[PDB]
Symmetry: D2
Subunit: 312 residues, 4 copies
Amino acid sequence: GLTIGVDIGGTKIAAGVVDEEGRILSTFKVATPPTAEGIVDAICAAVAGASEGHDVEAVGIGAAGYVDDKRATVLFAPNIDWRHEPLKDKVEQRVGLPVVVENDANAAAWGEYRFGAGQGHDDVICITLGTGLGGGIIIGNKLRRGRFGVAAEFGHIRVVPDGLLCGCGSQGCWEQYASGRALVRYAKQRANATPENAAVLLGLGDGSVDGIEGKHISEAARQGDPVAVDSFRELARWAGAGLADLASLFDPSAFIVGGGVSDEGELVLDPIRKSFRRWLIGGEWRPHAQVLAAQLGGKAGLVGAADLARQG
Amino acid sequence: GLTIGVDIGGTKIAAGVVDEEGRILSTFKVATPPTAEGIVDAICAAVAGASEGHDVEAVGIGAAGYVDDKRATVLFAPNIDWRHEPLKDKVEQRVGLPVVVENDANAAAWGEYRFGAGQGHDDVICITLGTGLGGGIIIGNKLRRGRFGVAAEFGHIRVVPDGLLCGCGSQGCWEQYASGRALVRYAKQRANATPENAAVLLGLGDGSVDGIEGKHISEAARQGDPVAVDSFRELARWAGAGLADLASLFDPSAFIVGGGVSDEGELVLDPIRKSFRRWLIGGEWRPHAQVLAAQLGGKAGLVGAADLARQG
Amino acid sequence: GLTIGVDIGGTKIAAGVVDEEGRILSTFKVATPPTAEGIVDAICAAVAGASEGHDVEAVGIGAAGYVDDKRATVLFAPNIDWRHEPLKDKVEQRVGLPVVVENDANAAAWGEYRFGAGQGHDDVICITLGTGLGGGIIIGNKLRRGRFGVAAEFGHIRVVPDGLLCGCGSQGCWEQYASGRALVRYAKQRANATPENAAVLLGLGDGSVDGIEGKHISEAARQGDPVAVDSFRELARWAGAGLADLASLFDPSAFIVGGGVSDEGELVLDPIRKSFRRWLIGGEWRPHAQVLAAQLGGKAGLVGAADLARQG
Amino acid sequence: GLTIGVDIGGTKIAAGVVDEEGRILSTFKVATPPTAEGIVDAICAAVAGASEGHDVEAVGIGAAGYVDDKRATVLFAPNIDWRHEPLKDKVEQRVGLPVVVENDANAAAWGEYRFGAGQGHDDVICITLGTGLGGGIIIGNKLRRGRFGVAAEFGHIRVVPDGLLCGCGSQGCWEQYASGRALVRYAKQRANATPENAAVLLGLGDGSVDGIEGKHISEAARQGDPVAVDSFRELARWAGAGLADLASLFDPSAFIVGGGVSDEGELVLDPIRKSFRRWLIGGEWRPHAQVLAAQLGGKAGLVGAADLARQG
Ligand SMILES: OC[C@H]1O[C@@H](O)[C@H](O)[C@@H](O)[C@@H]1O
Ligand SMILES: OC[C@H]1O[C@@H](O)[C@H](O)[C@@H](O)[C@@H]1O
Ligand SMILES: OC[C@H]1O[C@@H](O)[C@H](O)[C@@H](O)[C@@H]1O
Ligand SMILES: OC[C@H]1O[C@@H](O)[C@H](O)[C@@H](O)[C@@H]1O
Ligand code: NA
Ligand code: NA
Ligand code: NA
Ligand code: NA
Ligand SMILES: [Zn+2]
Ligand SMILES: [Zn+2]
Ligand SMILES: [Zn+2]
Ligand SMILES: [Zn+2]
């Protein structure tokens, strides 16, 4: 039958009814509230909104945090105020439907494996670029959550010793260098330094550096705004180097890049792919994985979460 | 029946006859020669020496390099002169027994999973500390080699951007910071700076910095030589931080540390474990893997390689 | 005659009447307000308070920012809201006395050269550890401010490429790794990870991590609190490595460490000195500078600023 | 009258007779031999060759190492086998003329200050890019050697913690990232990865990566060889970032870039200057130094050394 998927990210909540073939039948979006209690309210509003007109059997939540092996509790989140949050229990008692809670990028990996760019592969690795950087692991045709449920937390691999402060409480985490937030940071740095090379970018906002938004950077880069193009170059430096490290770790047939910015397709995927190829160890002597945009784009997580609910 | 395992590392070749329960029935050791042709000669000598007195059915090779998915060819090695080396074919035609070629640390992981510290677990990660740093992945009770056979090359994950030159041709690789060679480097740095704190260490060699060998550092640290103890501290800084990154990646129930220096047990494992716990993301909010010495120590690879031959 | 020195730091304003031999005759302290206009008010209050009972001829300001070659304007400050601030003009029109504006750590260097640990030397380098990290250069018995007045901004030398965000707008600046603020950061990190090793430290505050203050860390370290001792070790790692770089740059006869934490003397100077000696290039082949506490401690800047006013 | 200058670098020895206006009247070049005794022989050959036809009064040596405050002894050299080498005494007894020994880049700074790009300035900083990276400091119209003679060893400032091994015995030194040797390294890395983008570069040598020489990279970049252009970009990343750090340290009116590659002028200076401006702290709020090629190019050191002999 039909289930609902709800993707709860640091910035946005998105929900939809999803059928057995991963077709999205409805859309609901709302901003992620700042408190755990407000988030439960918003989840309920999202489920109610997306469910309009449809007979719904279960709810799958893709949550932006460390989710336990029982798929019920958000143990820890760097960019949302969740600490040992019993999300399954709270949502079940309010919506009156069975709920499964999965990590958001685990869910995106699953969505792409079933219905997107991972179809036909056995071993694929997903990264999502958004508020943070999430990971998802498909090995031997199965999602791998690890012993304690918290595998694929790629965003907190240390890429710069003693580097940037992260929401997780550590320093130098990959997500501080490769994420939608990092992209925005790169563009604001560059627009502040050389505003004369950011005219198009600034014109898409309110004209100020502070008014630069992720989607502006994408549109401006399409139009050839040098500062926007350079910001994507910097994002790709770190995203591609990290994908090369993931090739050393997992050696998959494909990497699948999701998150909101993956909606931009080759605009972001081409520099990431080129960077991956520059960083891949062993030069000419070893094979290279494909580097692919999430076919479902930013919706992969809600689709995968919906489908993971259906297999409950 | 009985098979032979041969572990070919950057420094040493070790072979032995191994029974069905992973008992080692014979030992042969020789230094790794500098050329690929000399290595084939040494493999043949090792097989002949270890095989004395025993009826042997197959040969498993654990090779210190990137091994292909067909388990026959060393694609690339950073510390041995192998480039697309058809090791299976060359050894088969000379010994007249079936041969399987596996990566050495893949083989160590398998040996520990079957006969050592990984028994009873479903998801474990092995690192070996030796000439280089090797990895091995057991997920869902199975060795995972990846799409192209070259998963678990943990030694070439970039831990320091623009860092130390590595034999793989890249910079900043984990193995330049955590390996037996790195340990020796740390001790020589420290003994050169403060020889008065290295009296015991230098006394175990020829009295010179250049004469410091890995095994001297271990023995000296047991005796409380401050420079040797400090060198183990530095090795553990990098080994433990990397294990914390592997927890972010794989979230296994256990890490198993092998390689020659794992022969030292808690001398090296205790600082590595303590370091792992200091670096593990998420503080009190998430569970910690065990950090264990390879029960087979430096012999895990030959045992695992022997057993992988038997399942051919 | 007598002049007033006023040291305006990121956290504190301190003023005093200073005689010709650098004796401090009065003390006034107030917290640094958050706005430039509030700071001018506070400077006036500090001058009035310190001046009680004394015939005062001039005012010297040691300001925590980039000061111009005319010694009148704060061009830029990372931790105070000053941008092209005409501090000399604003204070002169309100106090009715001649004013000279110097960088705070330039003033501290001068105070120590004239009246403190730099006496008898010709070439000394000062660093101050406080809200930020400041520098001061004495070469050939003269304070060196550079062509544009902004020499000795040692706090913004990049020590970690792509490292921690700094108030100056760049990343990886020395002051993010060595300063009083960094010390507090190190202690809060360590007390959060292992509170059982921070009992004494937490007991000196309100019992919480958030309640840890710099002075608590110092007192706790004196009492042997392991977390406090470890925090000083981490501060010294970065402070000493940077002093070794300054030896490569300037090769002075002495380094003088000032700022509020220098009030602690050998508690902080001993680990910094030991670290300096570990990092100094060239081992046994080259001589080492002295590493000394500011004899005037945190008051060096106000003394030096007072004296720089007198030579106007 | 006339003196001889001799510049002894890691790769090359160059000598010439120099008049009072810094005009070079003769040229002699020979490769730097591998032993200290062979170097003294080569110095004597260089002095004899350059002196042909000329009445010579003194010899100034610009030596690529840490030179003492007495200007007589090479205390330490990272790229030449000198340890406490009494160069003045050895050369004086063999040539029978007075000798002064200065650091090579100190001598280059002096040559440029007197006869080149530093004319008219009071405070300038020189870096030389060659076998290593050297520095020279002019402050208040005077060369500054520091208390122990070893100021301006900019090549061994640590730019990457735990970075590349340096000849000085430390890691992460600036000279491993910015020097002629680093340039060659960058080009060989890039030509090995993408030889199809290095056709012109490889054609100027023997066609192999191993045959790439510094001068080939320069010529190829002029012709628009993408790999050569990219190598200069990478050199400039590190050289410019370091110059921005030197602006924080010294705030001079000008930086002067010397060494053999400075012979190329704007080919290398333009990317270095642009990089400097990108990295300079404080954006629009503070003034920028000039970044200039050594007017004497690679000959600055021999000219400056000759002139420093004349002021003995
Ligand atoms: O939302 C993307 C990712 O953000 C990271 O900060 C969280 O640790 C992950 O659990 C999540 O998958
Ligand atoms: O021998 C340990 C490891 O050394 C590394 O340098 C090689 O890349 C690996 O394949 C090997 O497992
Ligand atoms: O207050 C100490 C130092 O703090 C730094 O952040 C400022 O840039 C310096 O100008 C000041 O000397
Ligand atoms: O030759 C350039 C520079 O090379 C460096 O390696 C040496 O330490 C310096 O003394 C010298 O000036
Ligand atoms: Na995940
Ligand atoms: Na492996
Ligand atoms: Na200063
Ligand atoms: Na010099
Ligand atoms: Zn993190
Ligand atoms: Zn490597
Ligand atoms: Zn800064
Ligand atoms: Zn060095």
